[PDB]
């Protein structure tokens, strides 16, 4: 409402956050559809940024980079995290939402 | 038709239990008594209508039962024989009702 | 006690029955049973007794079951066989065509009171026992099996002319003391209520293999007569289904271990088999299938990976030699056994899931697309083995009901065009494979090949021949089911309805010969094969129908004349049934053995004739719909139709660019080739090869069926309208 140019940017972001992929259970939860739709969501964010309804602003571009997973931006945002376990949970939330103990150690390292 | 579904489940029970015909016959009597108690002896015509419509519903259900099974099996021969007897029961009810209602209205029209 | 037992069973199981009257034998058996129940229901020791006495009771009820069966072969009283009977009012068993009169006497002889009270004795002895005695209770379950064995009944025959018995193998009567005692014992079961079935459920879930089999058989026979479903209600309430279905995750992992070279012992396979049989018992109930669907069983199966691995060979590598045990079947066969129960439960749920069959078929098609690779391999595999024929038959059973574009129109809606196109491309793969199935196995040379494949062993060769023949019959019936569903679905359309075949009898003539039997000839299934297949299959089916009709009639004559046959023919029949016979055995036993052979063969031929009539009438439907499409709607290239040349062939055209290549081109599936010269040549060829003899054969054959599904005549409509369309050309 305040920024006319950023209003479209905010609407696109709000639409993306409204269409966050969630669990898929038809009697048993399906991780496959889960990662597929998350990847498609990442693709949609990239296409929004390329179309410019999700770009052209430093904050929005940084947010899209973080959503796709951007280590240097997170490490610059080390203030808002302040903790490496928060770093770990952000990394997993933004690149590997379905983690196994076999890779938890790699990601923690 | 739900009646088809109750036919399926009662036939699932009825294959492990008695023939459908005897159960169908026995199911009618409570309706007989309900109609007789709820209705007077001057509304005999509506009472006959009650018998007919309900026992037509039982014909409906019983042919629904017998139609799906193999009729070339002698298991259903006795049930079907009882069934043709049921249709003869229709025709007997219809015949008596028609003759005696005709007699009543003829006594009325004897002017 | 060990010695006294061993003594009595040596008295029983090994000694000939003939030396002493069986009346006295069974009398003494029940007397011993009542006295031992007295002593041990009153107890004579502590836990140390239940194992030994439980094995005792095991073998005692075994011997009593088979001994009562020995009486079941002999009449007692003054009449148990012959013209007149006057003792059948004493039991729920009554007269029937040969076989049941001797059985009814065996129970009219015995005091049902004693039977019922002694089984009460058993059950009360059971119920007072506590837990932790799994092998004791195993003896107990087996003892119950041995008793109810006597009360068990076999499957009914399959008759067409109705000339042999179909009674007293079931409970369909207020009578059938079998059924009434079953109802009483059902009441006693429910009197035991939650605790007893708690015990049996825990014993079936975590017990030992043998005891698991005993419990499963007990449950199956109890459920086969239960009409009150307390068991279903309680097991649903308790969530045992939840732990059981979650145990299939462990089944997946163990079977994934078993597929590796040198698999461990078959006990895990037996365990999975027993679990699957239990789930089949569950799916038998409509409500049970409802809860199975509600639980997302197919979703769990799809998430499992075991069916994704299939033992398949290559022309290269170490393939051609197995490192698995030679006493166990091929790993490919083991995987077939692995995948089979999932397909069986799928076909059961699709059949019985009519209300939610939308979701059932959606999950089923998810299963198929997940396992399409193995499914495609089986579809494209030409084997000729019984196992492969069963594979294809059950695959078609799934596809004919599941792989419908209507299911994609009703579910999966709103998905992306990429998902839509992938799903429909797989669907089209399934239609093309189904079409190629008729080209592969609609030929007649398969008959000679399979008739010759079963001459290695003649004891089971007859059964093998019947099995492959029936398997082909269901495959034909079933691809026709798929086609009929598709045609009924596409019926309301008038611009998107295409016919799968093109009109020609050149291929009709060609198929009557060999298919260059090194690779089975297939008409191009991406290029729309011809109605010559339909007409050739129909003519072959008519010929074989007269064949099996006449042999069935003769077999029925033999079955009714079995009383009049001399010793030698019946001896031959008994030898053909089991490798023991001759005239040293009883004439009645010989008659029964011959009649049982005749019953099974009559059942086979009856099923054959019925389904063959099915394919015949559905061929009529195919001919009708093709004639309707071609003679009324297809554009002709020799002239301008009044309003039909503006009507394109069924379905719209691809916008994707492809080159016409002689392999896997669905773009060719969209065009029919129709011309007036084609119409004239087709009409003349039909008039000549579709003889009035064939028409009269169809009409007289179609004068006894359609009674089972009881819908008004469509058969004469199809025959007459096909006849008219044959005489009616393009408008």
Short mmCIF file of C-alpha atoms in Angstrom, two decimals, chain B residues 4 84 110-111:
data_model
loop_
_atom_site.label_atom_id
_atom_site.label_comp_id
_atom_site.label_asym_id
_atom_site.label_seq_id
_atom_site.Cartn_x
_atom_site.Cartn_y
_atom_site.Cartn_z
CA UNK B 4 -30.91 -52.95 -4.69
CA UNK B 84 -44.88 -67.36 -8.31
CA UNK B 110 -79.25 -50.78 -7.66
CA UNK B 111 -81.46 -47.66 -8.17
#
